[PDB]
Structures are given as C-alpha cells and as structure tokens.
C-alpha cells in the first residue's frame, strides 16, 4: 500500500538524520517540510525503487501523487531513479500519463549491464 512505504521512508529519514546531530515526531509528510525547524539543516533526498517492475502501479501512482505534494517550501530537493530491467516504452504507457507528463521534464538515460562495450 502507500501509507506503509511512507512510514518506512520517514522512519529511515528521522533515524538517519537524528544520531548524526544528537523528542519524537510521527511518521508523515509534515515532518519533511518540518525538517528545518527541528534540526536546522536542509535536506536532499534520493529515491531508489529497487525492483521497479514487479509492483502495484496503482499504489505507485498513488504514492508519487502523494510525493509531489511537497514542492512548496523552497528549502528542499529530491530525485528519483528507476532501476529498470525491461524498457521504458513497455511501461510508460502502463502507468497513467498524468504521472508521466512532468516525468517528461528532466530525465536521464543509461545503458547498464555487466558487459559494457567489451
């Protein structure tokens, strides 16, 4: 589902950025936009959808629509990667183009294998 993987994200983030600087906040999207006024520092995230293919694209769509709800605080950046196994045109029309428009904006592309170029 959506909510669980969100809780995973926030648990990772807070238990990561706490001990590096030495009270509790719940696990929600408020916390990220509330990062400034607990620890003082700004933050930059990076997202790795590990096995990008074998997952509920609906839940995915829900999630990424949730995640676009935090580009209004002028103090944060993030980035996503898809670690793909098949192909873009296989799945860039499997998911709703609502998601895909902005995903036309600023992307990057690699050929990726064990045997690169002999």
């Amino acid at each position: 589902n959506v909510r669980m993987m969100l809780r995973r994200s926030m648990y990772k983030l807070y238990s990561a950025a706490d001990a590096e600087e030495h009270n509790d906040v719940s696990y929600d999207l408020s916390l990220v936009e509330n990062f400034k006024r607990l620890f003082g520092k700004d933050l930059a995230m990076v997202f790795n959808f590990k096995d990008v293919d074998s997952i509920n694209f609906n839940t995915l769509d829900n999630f990424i629509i949730l995640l676009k709800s935090a580009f209004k605080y002028d103090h944060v950046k993030i980035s996503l990667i898809f670690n793909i196994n098949t192909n873009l045109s296989n799945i860039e029309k499997n998911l709703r183009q609502s998601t895909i428009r902005l995903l036309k904006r600023n992307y990057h592309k690699l050929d990726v294998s064990s045997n690169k170029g002999f």
Binding site: L6, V25, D28, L29, S30, L66, A70, S98, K104
Partner: protein
C-alpha cells in the same frame, strides 16, 4: 460587516455567496459549510484570494492529500490549533499540551476544552476557520466520517470565547450526494468553457512564460533588434490560440495538463 470583495473575473457568483456567508462576527456565519468544486477551477486559489480580500479574518490550513487516515489529522490539528493560538496571542500564558497526545476525537475535544478553559479570560468571543483540502481525496477513506466533523460545534460548550468553523473541498459529487440530507449550505464551481479557460490562462501563465528564459535566449540566438513586449505577449498569445485551437479537442476546459504540455513543447 464591511467585506472587501475580490473583483475576480470568473467567480463573482461564489464571491457573492461566501462574502455574504462570512464575516468577523460568527453569528452571521453558518455552523458548517461546503465549497465543492472541480480541479483547476482555483477553488483553493480563490479561497486564499478572498482571505487576501479580508486580512483580519484568519484560518488554519491542512492538506490531507498527504495524510492517510484519521488519527494523523487529529495530531496535525491538535498541533496547529494551539500553535496558532499562542502565536497570535503572545502575551497570553499557557500550559502547551502535546498534540501527539491526541489519538481519538474525544481526546482532541478534551484537550481543546482544556485550551479553552485556559483561554477563558478573553475580552470578546472569536470563531476561527479550519480547512481540509481534499477530504474526499483520502486514501483509506470510508463513509462513517463527515457527519462526525459536522458534529464538532455539537459537543463544544456554548460558553466558548474561542470557537472554530469547518471548510471542505470535493470533486465527484457522488459521495456528496450520498449525504445532503443535513440541509447544508454549499457553493460550487462549474467546469469552465473555452473562452473562460482561455482568459484564465492568458491572465495566469502569461507573466510566467513571458518571463521564462527561452525568450531571452532566442531573441539573441537570432540577434534581431526589432522588439517590444507588446508583441512578446502578442506572439505568446497567438501561439496559445494555436495551442488551444489544437488541443481543446484533446481535453476541453482544463489547465493543468495544458501547462505541462506547454512547458514541454513551448521550447
């Protein structure tokens, strides 16, 4: 009560409705009201556009698009309530309770009762305004819900120097229609039409992409000194005539995806 109207282009109906509904004195405000709409209409744009029209009225803002369930709303609410209180009454003393102490609306009610019995000593009474944008758009939503949030003026004692009010925003109308038996005020926004969305875009995105770089790029990639910003807006304008004369057929009376595809294919 003197209310400055927002002299808007396209919603002076709902402007009339809500600037009539609401003023500083709570008595001439209803107990619970909806502002349903549809996306892109700037319902959320125009609410704050009205708060621009009226500064001395204040409201809290929540966005449960990101929240998932009921308890997280409780927690965020219990935070923002007393946050807003003490931020705007600085001189007042307090015993600031934990917002995470809430785990159930009863507990929210209890701690608000405590907020009030500590805020007992005010000079005049005050009603404030709560905002839940997309309360239909929740992600584990069930149907046992909206009646409860109606019932918050229910259990509050009547001797409250500090009261509150509720605000909503929905889409479908199906689960709205499920519940209108409670004889509720409501204000609404029809999906726009082609000259309407046209003029909304020529007034909204005009300054944006008139003041994006690629103009300033191209003018001097070409190196041509015959120019004025009238014609800049003009060529942008007829370009967008072309855009919409193409893809009105594709979409109709929306803005968001048009903005996307503009950003992509503009350059």
């Amino acid at each position: 009560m003197n209310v400055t109207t927002p002299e808007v282009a396209f919603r002076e109906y709902q402007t009339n409705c809500l600037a009539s509904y609401i003023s500083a004195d709570p008595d001439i405000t209803p107990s619970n009201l909806i502002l349903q709409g549809y996306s892109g209409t700037g319902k959320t744009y125009t609410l704050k556009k009205y708060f621009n029209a009226n500064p001395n009225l204040h409201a809290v803002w929540l966005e449960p698009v990101e929240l998932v369930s009921w308890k997280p709303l409780l927690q965020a609410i219990a935070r923002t309530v007393q946050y807003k209180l003490k931020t705007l009454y600085p001189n007042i003393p307090t015993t600031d309770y934990d917002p995470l102490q809430v785990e159930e609306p009863f507990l929210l009610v209890k701690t608000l009762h405590n907020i009030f019995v500590q805020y007992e000593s005010l000079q005049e009474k005050t009603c404030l305004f709560l905002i839940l944008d997309g309360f239909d758009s929740l992600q584990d939503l069930d149907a046992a819900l909206f009646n409860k949030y109606i019932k918050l003026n229910e259990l509050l004692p009547k001797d409250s120097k500090i009261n509150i009010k509720f605000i909503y925003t929905m889409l479908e109308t199906s689960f709205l229609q499920r519940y209108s038996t409670h004889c509720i005020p409501t204000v609404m926004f029809p999906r726009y039409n082609v000259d309407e969305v046209s003029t909304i875009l020529v007034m909204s995105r005009c300054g944006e992409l008139m003041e994006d770089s690629c103009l300033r790029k191209r003018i001097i990639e070409e190196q041509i000194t015959d120019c004025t910003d009238d014609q800049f807006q003009n060529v942008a304008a007829n370009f967008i005539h072309l855009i919409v004369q193409a893809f009105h057929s594709y979409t109709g009376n929306d803005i968001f995806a048009l903005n996307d595809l503009i950003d992509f294919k503009w350059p």
